[PDB]
Amino acid sequence: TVADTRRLITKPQNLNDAYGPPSNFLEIDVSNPQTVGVGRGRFTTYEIRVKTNLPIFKLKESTVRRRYSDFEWLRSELERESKVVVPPLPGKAFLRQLPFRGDDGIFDDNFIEERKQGLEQFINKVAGHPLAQNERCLHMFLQDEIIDKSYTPSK
Amino acid sequence: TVADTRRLITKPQNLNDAYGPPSNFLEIDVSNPQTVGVGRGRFTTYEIRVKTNLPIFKLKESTVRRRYSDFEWLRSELERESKVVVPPLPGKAFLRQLPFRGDDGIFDDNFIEERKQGLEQFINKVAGHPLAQNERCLHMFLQDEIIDKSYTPSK
Amino acid sequence: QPELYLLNTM
Amino acid sequence: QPELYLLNTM
Amino acid sequence: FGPICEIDIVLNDGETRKMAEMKTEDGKVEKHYLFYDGESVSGKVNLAFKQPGKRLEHQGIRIEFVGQIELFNDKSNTHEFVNLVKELALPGELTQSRSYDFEFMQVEKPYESYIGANVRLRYFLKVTIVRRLTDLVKEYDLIVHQLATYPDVNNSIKMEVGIEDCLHIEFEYNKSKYHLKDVIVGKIYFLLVRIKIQHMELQLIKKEITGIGPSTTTETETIAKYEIMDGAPVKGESIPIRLFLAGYDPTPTMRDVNKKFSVRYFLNLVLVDEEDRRYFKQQEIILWRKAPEK
Amino acid sequence: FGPICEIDIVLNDGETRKMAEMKTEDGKVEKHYLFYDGESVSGKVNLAFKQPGKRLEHQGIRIEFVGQIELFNDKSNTHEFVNLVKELALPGELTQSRSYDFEFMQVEKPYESYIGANVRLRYFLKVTIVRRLTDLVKEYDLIVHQLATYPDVNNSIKMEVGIEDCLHIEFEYNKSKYHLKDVIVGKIYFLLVRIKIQHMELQLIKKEITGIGPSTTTETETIAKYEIMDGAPVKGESIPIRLFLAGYDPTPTMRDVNKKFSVRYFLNLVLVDEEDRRYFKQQEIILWRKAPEK
Amino acid sequence: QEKLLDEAIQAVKVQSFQMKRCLDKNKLMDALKHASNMLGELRTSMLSPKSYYELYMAISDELHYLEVYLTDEFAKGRKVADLYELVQYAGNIIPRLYLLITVGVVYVKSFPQSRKDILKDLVEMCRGVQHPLRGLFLRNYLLQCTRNILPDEGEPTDEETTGDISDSMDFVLLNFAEMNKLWVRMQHQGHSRDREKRERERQELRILVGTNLVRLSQLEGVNVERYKQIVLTGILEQVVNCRDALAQEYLMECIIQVFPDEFHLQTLNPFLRACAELHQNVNVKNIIIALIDRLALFAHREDGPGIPADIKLFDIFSQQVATVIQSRQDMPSEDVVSLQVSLINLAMKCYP
Amino acid sequence: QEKLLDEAIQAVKVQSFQMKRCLDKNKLMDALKHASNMLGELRTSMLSPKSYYELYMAISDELHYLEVYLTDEFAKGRKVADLYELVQYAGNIIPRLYLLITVGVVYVKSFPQSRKDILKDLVEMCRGVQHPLRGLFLRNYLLQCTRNILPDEGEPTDEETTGDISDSMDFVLLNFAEMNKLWVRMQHQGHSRDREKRERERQELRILVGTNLVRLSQLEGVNVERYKQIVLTGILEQVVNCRDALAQEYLMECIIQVFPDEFHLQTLNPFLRACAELHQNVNVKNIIIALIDRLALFAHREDGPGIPADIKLFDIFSQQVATVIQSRQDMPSEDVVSLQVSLINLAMKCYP
């Protein structure tokens, strides 16, 4: 004997499992930024489009509109109940709200684009996380059309 | 075997040695005390009679007259050359020479008797001693008729 | 910095 | 007090 | 001037006897003679006298066989578990060079030599020429290896672990006790995979625990990182493991040596997802120095 | 109150093992267990806990086998030639009674136990419960005897001695080396007798020499006075000697034990003349403990 | 970008130069360290499929100078034992496995007695493979390494040398099933919007897959009975089990083209019943036409026995094509007629 | 003084009380410690030989009760070995050796195989003693102990018993030489002014000397043939070589009395040449007359062979006596005639 070729013996993989589509599908797109209101009320909302095949998510496909405050509320709820180290948001830019800047302020396009990517960055990390998927706040955010802030945090 | 009866083997004793007289004969008698002189000169002498069969003594029998000073001279010579711890003499009694005592002084009989025994005591110890028999002073004392104090101590 | 989750026995 | 003389070899 | 005298030890079997190596600090490698529990240590102490004309006044020469455990490099915290003495010379002089025979009969050496972070265990011969104010001392280091035989009981490790409704796996390693040049033959079987796994690796981890009771310091060092999977499995998939321990040159597992320190090894299985989150399961394995036939 | 805890040692072979006796100061006789070079010492340390309700806080329990040489009753002048340790407990507590096993494997005991004037050599087990200010310590004494076989060379002592032209004799003792229950078979042969001999006797003399170099103290003790002649011999006479050493219970000859002390025996032949002058010749004999078959 | 590639090939040529430098100077482990750092260059993956492929082929060609060096060394007797353990010290799985294949084939050449054991080990340990790109290129390296030395029937059979044609067949079918799995897995990795890019890349790699069949075909052991009993049973098991269409169709035409009609004739009803269960989105028509064309050139191919009378091709093919049409749901009737045209041509040319 | 004597006899009676107390309670070693205490009393020098004799006889007769006591215990099976070392524990040589003799004879009875060895041992172990009085008293204990256990013609020839007549003869010749040596040394010991005390003392111990010959005479094994060749030849060399007069005369009188005419007729003339060299200072007339008296009772003795005619006894003694007279220096003429008278009576009655 010239080569140690030892392996433990394996169970043949069932052909449904082997070929059938994987059970870890989860993609969330942050897209289509839009102003809502006029004058001092104005704020931007984004489309949070979900596609999945994980049983925990109660809709395989969903689309909802979200505000940057909502993203802060999600992160804030997860920091309390979850005990998950939550990733950072792309940041509240307060001084952009101040008037007579050299850009469009809170509605600057290089800003909204860069923020939009950060939210996509954030939500895919959070939503992929195992301990995060249990918590009611994440589903509330992704798949209820409006968030109910006066809620009792479960799961 | 019930008793350990081990001895080394011995040489038979030759019958001349076994019966013939022993070779350690030595007896010295101090006897016959006598005044010599008149008045202030007077002193007592004793007879020192020797009988022996030791080869070292040049006469088998001898008789000489000795004074107590002679006994002191013998003891004094032996203390120098011999390195023998010499026994004590019966003692110079100086105050017996003083006049108008309640006894005959130096010529008291209880004194002369007691001294005489002490000298016999002394001379038999000294003369029996092995290291003492070598020294010329002992033979000079016992077997020369007069002692030669101006001598060179030999042996 | 990088999350570390212990795998539990079933 | 009592004299002690070592015996020499011959 | 220099030194008046130089102490040199020369073992009786200094030609034929096998040596062994020791990894010390900053990657240095020392080489000392190899000994085993039960062996006799014997040889010659040779004193080279260097200053001709001068004389060396001493109050005795001795040689000691010493085995001890040093903690935190703290001289006050050294502990001798074996000490044997052979007095070589009484108080006297030395005008010229001289040698002295010594033999320590069938010497007990209960532990294996080890140099760690907060622990050293070493054997040595210590020659001591005692002088009025300052002793001339010469240490002479030795390695002791502790051998063992194939174990009576050796069960495979097999375990179903996971994160609930996310990842279930069954890992299996073929033994609990592996010799120093042994091989981890194993497999990872996937029962449920609802996370996105980038890669998986087996790690070999060496913990060195020092102290007594609440006084406990653990020094961990990740000896091997060994990739075993590259990409996402699905359920029903088996991944083979063949990790040759010869490659990493570890020490034996050493458990409560003199009630002072442990040195333990662990197989840390680690999966890493697409967002770099890191799922793991540690399993202690015992290592042991195999006795070669002879 | 009393003591909080009492230490008691009980050897595993405490029923079957043979004991031996030791003459100490003022004629006292102790009895301890008997051991031999090479034997293993093993047993149990039993801690009787006496104060129920109370607790004993310690910083570790150990047991030591100790063999040492004590000089002039001076604690600073004790010298340990054998020391072995078994740690029994780590720092902790004791609320109730507990025992601990110990074994010292094949223990080296190079010397025989001896209690003299300026020297003691003793072996013992020393249990030590370490406490904050004052250790609880229990010593447990053992006797070690050193055995030997019939010697290779054993020549008779034979010697012509005397005073020139006064006394010549030839004495002969059948051996140079006698065991402890042996017999001096000898003879005195007279070649020349020109002194007057009252009596003759053989004496057994035990010298105990302590110290190093010029530091030397000899303690002499005349163990036996044994009359062998009564009266004047003449030349050609032989006097037999048969002196049973069993009667006087001596120790073995012990020569430069650890370069610290000797214990030597001498046969002092003494003749005494009519004026009490005393002629003698000393001769060293070696004593040795005979090994009984088994 | 395309720069990554030139910079990479530069660094590669550097490490493989210092590698071959160390191999001529005969200090082996230093050469293996440069070879290892060079293969580290393969740890970048952003390369285009084409670009990465060139870097792969470049490195394979340099490794050939090493393989002949080793082959010679072993033929010279200078063999160092336990090479797998020493090489497993390389911290990553990639150096280990490149080393294992390289040394494996050297041992097989030098130790034909070890051939069965080495192959069984390599085939079993490759189940570790999970990543599509590196796995594909590795198993390609496998396929080229296994070009000739696999067991065969007209081969000297030293009872130290273990392994037969059946073992070679099991070898290639297993490595195939694993590689095809990863390759189909390539369909869904990455975002769903790279599907045309993905399918283009896979189409590029289809030849990699077909090369396995080429390897299966040079196998002298392929008799009609092994073809009947082993080969088609394995392939049809994966095919029916994979229920995909692009791969199945490519592989099945490559089969059609490759094997001799003698084998196909003995295995027609299994092959055509298998053909009938295939996916609905398949243009089975173009396949069937290709089939008709091959049997037509086979009918009028002379220097042959002609059509055995027991072989009622027309009744067989008629009933199976019929079954295929039932299995088809959306057939353009024009397609049915395009097939009817070839059905004419066949009946016309084989039995006027 | 006689007081010394009385204090000793009281302490003796006290100690002999402690003997019987210990003999009752079986405390042998305690009795023997007191036995040692009695012998400490023997260290005195002030007592007379008679006084020592009386005290000795007291201690000896009581010690026999101890001896028979011990002999009985041993006769009871309670045999203790290792006695030789233990008896050496006594500080004084006298208790040790007294113990050796006492237990030795016990071993002889209980172990007849040891008889020869033990007797040769005891005779040889007597070299320890050198003092005339205590040695004598020891050898008296010896003579009474060996009075009966010595080999002889009327002993059982038991193949366990050891020792012969030759051993007895060697034993007694040795004891003779030893006793005369010590005894003669007593002549010159002390001062020459005790000549009458010494000779009186000698007269006192003379019986001690004669008891040995008495012991020789009860010996049946004392036959005429051993007497002729070996026994008398041996005795006459020591006797003639002691060259004394008091001893020679006493022993010779004991001779006259002790031997039979059976011995004398075969050994007169060897014995008479021995008679002729003797020391000058001795009275020989009294010797000769005693001889004459015994041969006279033989001449007129009936139921006996008488004098063979070939051995002309009278002419022999006449010629030897003549030579002896020549050897005599100035012996009174009246004495010569007193001898002539017995020569007359004899020639008349033995050769009428």
Give residue H93's identity as a one-letter amino acid code: I
Do F138 and F167 belong to one domain? no
Chain F residues within an 8 Å CB radius of B13: 236-238
H124 touches chain F (CB under 8 A): yes
Physical contact, D and F (3 or more Cβ pairs within 8 A) = yes
Q: Is G110 left (phi over 0), alpha (psi -120 to 50) or beta?
A: alpha
Task: Establish if G319 belongs to a structural domain.
Answer: yes
C5 and A130 within 8 Å at the Cβ level: the answer is yes
Are the CB atoms for F45 and F7 separated by under 8 Å? yes
Task: Establish if B4 belongs to a structural domain.
Answer: no
Q: Which of E100, E118, E144 is the last residue of a domain?
A: E144
Q: Exposed/middle/buried for F62, CB within 10 Å: 0-12, 13-18, 19+?
A: middle
**Which residues in chain G precede a discontinuity of more than 2.5 Å between C and N?**
none
Task: Establish if A3 belongs to a structural domain.
Answer: no
Tokens 């392994």 locate to G163
Q: Which of F144, F167, F201 is the last residue of a domain?
A: F144
Q: Could you give the dihedral angle defined by the CA atoms of residues H10, H15, H16 and H18, in that order, rounded to the nearest 10 degrees?
A: 140
Q: Which of F122, F144, F166 is the last residue of a domain?
A: F144
CB half-sphere exposure, F150, CA atoms < 13 A: 5
CB half-sphere exposure, E267, CA atoms < 13 A: 28
| CATH number reported for the structural domain that contains residue F65 in this entry | 2.60.40.640
Instruction: Chain B: give the shortest CA distance to residue F194, in Å.
Output: 4
| Helices within H25-164 (DSSP H only) | 28-41, 49-75, 83-87, 93-110, 115-125, 132-149
Which residues of B touch chain F, with CB atoms under 8 Å apart?
A: 4, 6-8, 10-11, 13-14, 17-18, 20, 22-24, 26, 54-56, 124-125, 128-130, 133
Angle at E86 between CA E85 and CA E91, to 5 degrees: 110
B5 and H181 within 8 Å at the Cβ level: the answer is no
Question: According to the 3-state scheme, what is the secondary structure of F47-89?
Answer: EEECCCCCCEEECCEEEEEEEEEEECCCHHHEEEEEEEEEEEE
DSSP F124-183: EEEEEE--SS--EEEEEEEEE---BPPPS--PPEEEEEEETTTEEEEEEES-SEEETT-E
The partner residues of E35 in beta bridges, in order of sequence, read: E144
The token duo for F282 is: 């000393």
E231 and G128 within 8 Å at the Cβ level: the answer is no
Rg, C-alpha atoms of chain G: 24
G114 and A22 within 8 Å at the Cβ level: the answer is no
C5 and A85 within 8 Å at the Cβ level: the answer is no
F231 and H128 within 8 Å at the Cβ level: the answer is no
The token duo for H351 is: 């050769």
Q: Could you give the dihedral angle defined by the CA atoms of residues H260, H262, H268 and H269, in that order, rounded to the nearest 10 degrees?
A: -160
Interface C–E counts its CB contacts (< 8 A) at 34
A8 and E240 within 8 Å at the Cβ level: the answer is yes
Cα separations (Å) of A20 from A55, F113, G205, G244, H74? Answer: 16, 87, 22, 10, 112
Are the CB atoms for F195 and B24 separated by under 8 Å? yes
Which sign, positive or negative, has the C-alpha torsion B40, B46, B47, B50?
negative
Instruction: Report how far apart the first and last C-alpha atoms of chain D are (Å, whole number).
Output: 28
Do E136 and E181 belong to one domain? no
G85 and E238 within 8 Å at the Cβ level: the answer is no
Task: Please tell me which residue of chain F has the smallest CA distance to H89.
Answer: F247
Cα separations (Å) of H102 from B38, F243, G2, H51, H66? Answer: 71, 19, 129, 24, 10
Q: How far apart are CA H252 and CA H230, in angstroms?
A: 18
Do F184 and F240 belong to one domain? yes
Closest C-alpha to B155, from B138, B142, B60: B138
Tokens 């004629």 locate to F27
Q: How far apart are CA E138 and CA E128, in angstroms?
A: 7
| φ, ψ dihedrals at H231, nearest 5° | -65, -60
Closest C-alpha to E177, from E285, E263, E289: E285
Closest C-alpha to B46, from B142, B148, B125, B150: B142
DSSP E198-219: EEEEEEEEEEEEEEETTEEEEE
Task: Establish if E248 belongs to a structural domain.
Answer: yes
Task: Establish if E151 belongs to a structural domain.
Answer: no
What single DSSP character describes residue B81?
I
Rg, C-alpha atoms of chain A: 21
E195 and A125 within 8 Å at the Cβ level: the answer is no
C3 and A130 within 8 Å at the Cβ level: the answer is no
Q: How far apart are CA F42 and CA G12, in angstroms?
A: 70
Do F121 and F171 belong to one domain? no
Domain enclosing residue G328, as ranges = 259-352
Chain A residues within an 8 Å CB radius of C3: 84-85
Tokens 């050939």 locate to G64
Q: CB under 8 Å to F55, separation ≥6 — which residues?
A: F93, F94, F95
Are the CB atoms for B129 and F166 separated by under 8 Å? no
Task: Establish if B130 belongs to a structural domain.
Answer: yes
The partner residues of G275 in beta bridges, in order of sequence, read: none
| Structure-determination technique | cryo-EM
Task: Establish if B8 belongs to a structural domain.
Answer: no
Task: Establish if B149 belongs to a structural domain.
Answer: no
The token duo for H86 is: 């233990």
Q: How far apart are CA H289 and CA B47, in angstroms?
A: 50
Task: Please tell me which residue of chain A has the smallest CA distance to G121.
Answer: A5
D4 touches chain F (CB under 8 A): yes
Q: What is the tally of structural domains in chain H?
A: 1
Closest C-alpha to F19, from F9, F27, F30, F8: F30
Cα separations (Å) of A32 from A46, A93, A145, G193? Answer: 6, 20, 16, 18
**Which residues in chain E precede a discontinuity of more than 2.5 Å between C and N?**
none
Tokens 């590259």 locate to E230
| CATH number reported for the structural domain that contains residue A114 in this entry | 3.30.1520.10
The beta strand positions in G84-243, using DSSP E, are none
Closest C-alpha to G110, from G65, G158, G135, G75: G75
F235 touches chain H (CB under 8 A): no
Q: How far apart are CA E120 and CA E70, in angstroms?
A: 5
Task: Establish if F249 belongs to a structural domain.
Answer: yes
Angle at which helices H165-188 and H195-218 cross, to 10°:
180
D3 touches chain B (CB under 8 A): yes
Query: How crowded is residue F92: how many other Cβ atoms within 10 Å of its Cβ?
Result: 13
Cα separations (Å) of G305 from G298, G301, G347, H146? Answer: 11, 10, 18, 143
Chain F residues within an 8 Å CB radius of B6: 183, 185, 242
Rg, C-alpha atoms of chain D: 9
Q: What is the tally of structural domains in chain F?
A: 2
Question: According to the 3-state scheme, what is the secondary structure of E67-96?
Answer: EEEEECCCHHHEEEEEEEEEEEECCEEECC
Chain D residues within an 8 Å CB radius of B131: 5
B10 and F235 within 8 Å at the Cβ level: the answer is no
Most F-contacting residue of B10, B24, B129 (CB-CB within 10 A), to test interface: B24
Closest C-alpha to H264, from H233, H293, H291: H291
What percent helix, strand, coil does chain F show, rounded to 5?
Answer: 5, 60, 35
Instruction: Chain F: give the shortest CA distance to residue E206, in Å.
Output: 24
Task: Establish if H222 belongs to a structural domain.
Answer: no
Under DSSP, is residue H251 helix (H, G, I), strand (E, B) or coil?
helix
Instruction: Chain H: give the shortest CA distance to residue F248, in Å.
Output: 8
Do E200 and E126 belong to one domain? no
Most E-contacting residue of C1, C3, C7 (CB-CB within 10 A), to test interface: C7
Do E79 and E171 belong to one domain? no
Q: CB under 8 Å to B89, separation ≥6 — which residues?
A: B68, B71, B72, B75, B118, B119, B122
Instruction: Chain D: give the shortest CA distance to residue F288, in Å.
Output: 28
Query: How crowded is residue A76: how many other Cβ atoms within 10 Å of its Cβ?
Result: 12
Q: Could you give the dihedral angle defined by the CA atoms of residues E47, E53, E54 and E55, in that order, rounded to the nearest 10 degrees?
A: 60
Q: Exposed/middle/buried for G333, CB within 10 Å: 0-12, 13-18, 19+?
A: exposed
Q: How far apart are CA E144 and CA E123, in angstroms?
A: 7
Cα separations (Å) of E3 from E9, E63, E136? Answer: 17, 20, 10
E212 and F90 within 8 Å at the Cβ level: the answer is yes
Do E198 and E123 belong to one domain? no
Are the CB atoms for H70 and H19 separated by under 8 Å? no
Cα separations (Å) of G14 from G1, G10, G59, H279? Answer: 22, 6, 12, 138
B128 and F189 within 8 Å at the Cβ level: the answer is no
E277 and C10 within 8 Å at the Cβ level: the answer is no
Give residue A23's identity as a one-letter amino acid code: S
Q: Could you give the dihedral angle defined by the CA atoms of residues H95, H96, H97 and H100, in that order, rounded to the nearest 10 degrees?
A: 120
Do F86 and F130 belong to one domain? yes
Task: Establish if F95 belongs to a structural domain.
Answer: yes
CA max distance for chain B: 84
Under DSSP, is residue E12 helix (H, G, I), strand (E, B) or coil?
coil
The token duo for G59 is: 């490195």
Are the CB atoms for F208 and F178 separated by under 8 Å? no
Q: CB under 8 Å to G303, separation ≥6 — which residues?
A: none
Domain enclosing residue E9, as ranges = 5-144
C5 and E159 within 8 Å at the Cβ level: the answer is no
Under DSSP, is residue E292 helix (H, G, I), strand (E, B) or coil?
coil
Chains in contact with C via at least 3 Cβ–Cβ pairs below 8 Å:
A, E
F228 and H128 within 8 Å at the Cβ level: the answer is yes
The token duo for H140 is: 């008296």
Q: CB under 8 Å to H200, separation ≥6 — which residues?
A: none
D1 touches chain F (CB under 8 A): no
> What is the structure's resolution, reported in angstroms to one decimal?
9.5
Task: Please tell me which residue of chain C has the smallest CA distance to A87.
Answer: C1
Which residues of E touch chain A, with CB atoms under 8 Å apart?
A: 163, 165-167, 172, 174, 183, 185-187, 189, 192-196, 232, 234-238, 240, 242, 273-275, 277
E278 and C4 within 8 Å at the Cβ level: the answer is yes
Task: Establish if F149 belongs to a structural domain.
Answer: no
Tokens 């010295």 locate to B28
Closest C-alpha to E238, from E189, E171, E168: E189
B85 and D3 within 8 Å at the Cβ level: the answer is yes
Are the CB atoms for H258 and H217 separated by under 8 Å? yes
Task: Please tell me which residue of chain E has the smallest CA distance to G85.
Answer: E244
Q: Which of G110, G131, G148 is the last residue of a domain?
A: G110
Instruction: Chain E: give the shortest CA distance to residue C1, in Å.
Output: 10
The token duo for B149 is: 């104090």
Task: Establish if B148 belongs to a structural domain.
Answer: no
Instruction: Chain F: give the shortest CA distance to residue B155, in Å.
Output: 13
Angle at F57 between CA F51 and CA F62, to 5 degrees: 100
Task: Please tell me which residue of chain E has the smallest CA distance to A56.
Answer: E165
From the list D5, D6, D9, the residue facing F159 with the nearest CB is D9
CA max distance for chain E: 88
| φ, ψ dihedrals at G57, nearest 5° | -65, -35
Under DSSP, is residue G80 helix (H, G, I), strand (E, B) or coil?
coil
Query: How crowded is residue F14: how many other Cβ atoms within 10 Å of its Cβ?
Result: 11
The token duo for G265 is: 């004739």
F238 and B55 within 8 Å at the Cβ level: the answer is no
CA G55 to chain centre: 20
Q: What is the tally of structural domains in chain B?
A: 1
Domain enclosing residue A98, as ranges = 15-143
Q: How far apart are CA F246 and CA F290, in angstroms?
A: 12
Task: Establish if B53 belongs to a structural domain.
Answer: yes
F38 touches chain E (CB under 8 A): no
C2 and E169 within 8 Å at the Cβ level: the answer is no
Do F280 and F174 belong to one domain? yes
Chain A residues within an 8 Å CB radius of G181: 18-19
F247 touches chain H (CB under 8 A): yes
From the list B3, B15, B18, the residue facing H107 with the nearest CB is B3
Task: Establish if G241 belongs to a structural domain.
Answer: no
Task: Establish if F232 belongs to a structural domain.
Answer: yes
Instruction: Chain E: give the shortest CA distance to residue G89, in Å.
Output: 5
